[PDB]
Nucleic acid binder design. Structure first.
Ligand SMILES: Nc1ccn([C@H]2C[C@H](O)[C@@H](COP(=O)(O)OP(=O)(O)OP(=O)(O)O)O2)c(=O)n1
Ligand SMILES: [Ca+2]
Ligand SMILES: [Ca+2]
Ligand SMILES: [Ca+2]
Length: 438
DNA sequence: GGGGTGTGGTAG
DNA sequence: ATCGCTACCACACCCC
């Protein structure tokens, strides 16, 4: 066991943290895209008419961890057992659950302790460990298969297990549902073969937003083709409000307050007005939802098609550590800040940039919150504080950056024993060119 | 019109 | 036990 004051803490935490893995895998996929396209264009233009195939592994970690499970789980049945992937036994996140588990109401992100209560007696939850390297290998097979099929003009990485794949249709060609279904079935079968048993679902449409909703309707282990010309009340009635991309729990709560608790996207689209929507959730998010309820993308979402190199380019670099943070004094806090800045500077030098602006953010135990929260080593209920600094000259120098980060910590006034989380951010990245003469 | 700050929220 | 990350738009509210 490795405590936060141990030099090996960051290495250990990132080795175990699935959320760190997701972030790192996504960042690597974006960098790979940029490196592979440095001399190519491969951007969608205004003259192109396109179809979106949104392809995503079903219950990704649960599927892979099952297929790669150790001999102690040899008898586990993926079709009949409720399966989760997690580290622990109580207040530990279910990173992924299979569709048997979801039949009982279990969802990704739930704690094991919450999920166990949803099972009737005699039904036992199977908890599989993470298989991080094999998650990545299955991802490799997925992205390799997509490219090998030679059916897409543009393949955009969304996640370790998910890609937006764009097919341009010439005016030349009469696209049909039958042709799209055959492509869906080819993709699904080739990925199933190429990954040695993992399944993907596919949403197929003429917008990014409808392709995402079609993907949800397709799952598990299926495909759905719903173009704007195919839209119906039956389609909209099939979705919850937070099935919309960009709508999470906070936005959902506002929509339910404003529109008398709609229970489907059909309820919402029959009740809303654009003006009332903007007043409830904000101008830009309101417009996004209004357009989505017509099956249409907003301008911000379309940028990934028309300028993927800009959208996928990294603009900031940070670490966040909000688990395991228990320091007794400022000396140990300062050493942790130094270790984090060393880690960040290794990443910054790998991309050959400097930074011009940095931020320290912290989580501090709320005055009335227990010192030991419900989740072992968790941050618990906290107040957040952050402060940024503009550096005089863009730099990659540890002495400058770590000294200023430690200064920023002091300005926020958090006693070491009350600290529950820390974020170190390089907010603005600056190119390094061949001319460095003053 | 231009700039700045810290914070909210989402995704996977 | 248990590994609650992290990029990035949008916002509110401040300056000239
Ligand atoms: N709260 C979450 C959500 C996702 N993930 C990890 C594990 C997921 O398997 C993987 C992909 O996320 P998805 O949202 O695509 O979810 P799944 O693939 O598990 O299920 P599905 O896509 O079938 O709904 O990211 C996680 O660790 N914690
Ligand atoms: Ca998935
Ligand atoms: Ca996914
Ligand atoms: Ca959503």
């Amino acid at each position: 066991i490795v405590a936060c004051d141990d030099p090996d803490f960051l290495t250990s935490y990132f080795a175990h943290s699935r959320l760190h893995h997701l972030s790192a895998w996504k960042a690597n996929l974006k960098d790979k895209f940029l490196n592979e396209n440095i001399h190519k264009y491969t951007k969608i233009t205004d003259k192109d008419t396109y179809i979106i195939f949104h392809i995503d592994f079903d219950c990704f970690f649960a599927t892979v961890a099952y297929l790669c499970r150790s001999s102690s789980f040899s008898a586990c049945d993926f079709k009949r057992d409720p399966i989760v992937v997690c580290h622990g036994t109580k207040n530990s996140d279910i990173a992924s659950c299979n569709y048997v588990a979801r039949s009982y109401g279990i969802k990704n992100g739930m704690w094991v302790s919450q999920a166990e209560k949803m099972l009737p007696n005699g039904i036992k939850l199977i908890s599989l460990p993470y298989t991080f390297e094999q998650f990545q290998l299955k991802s490799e097979a997925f992205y390799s298969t997509l490219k090998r099929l030679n059916i897409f003009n543009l393949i955009l990485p969304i996640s370790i297990d998910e890609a937006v794949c764009v097919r341009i249709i010439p005016d030349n060609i009469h696209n049909t549902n039958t042709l799209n279904a055959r492509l869906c079935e080819e993709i699904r079968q080739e990925i199933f073969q190429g990954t040695n048993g993992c399944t993907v679902s596919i949403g197929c449409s003429d917008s990014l937003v409808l392709a995402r909703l079609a993907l949800k309707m397709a799952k598990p282990n299926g495909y759905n083709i719903t173009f704007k010309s195919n839209l119906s009340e039956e389609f909209w009635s099939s979705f919850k409000l937070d099935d919309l991309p960009g709508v999470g729990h906070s936005t959902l709560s506002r929509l339910e307050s404003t529109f008398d608790s709609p229970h489907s996207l059909n309820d919402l689209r029959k009740r809303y007005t654009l003006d009332a929507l903007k007043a409830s959730v904000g101008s830009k998010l309101g417009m996004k939802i209004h357009l989505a309820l017509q099956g249409q993308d907003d301008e911000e979402s379309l940028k990934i098609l028309y300028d993927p190199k800009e959208v996928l380019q990294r603009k900031s670099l940070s670490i966040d550590i909000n688990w395991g943070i228990r320091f007794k004094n400022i000396t140990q806090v300062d050493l942790f800040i130094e270790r984090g800045c060393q880690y960040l500077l290794e990443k910054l030098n790998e991309i050959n940039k400097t930074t011009s602006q940095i931020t320290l953010k912290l989580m501090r135990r709320c005055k009335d919150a227990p010192i030991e929260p419900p989740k072992y080593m968790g941050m618990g209920r906290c107040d957040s504080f952050s402060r940024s600094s503009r550096l005089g000259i863009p730099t990659n120098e540890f002495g400058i950056i770590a000294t200023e980060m430690k200064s920023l910590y002091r300005t926020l006034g958090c006693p070491p024993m009350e600290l529950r989380g820390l974020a170190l951010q390089f907010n603005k990245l600056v190119d390094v060119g061949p001319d460095n003469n003053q």
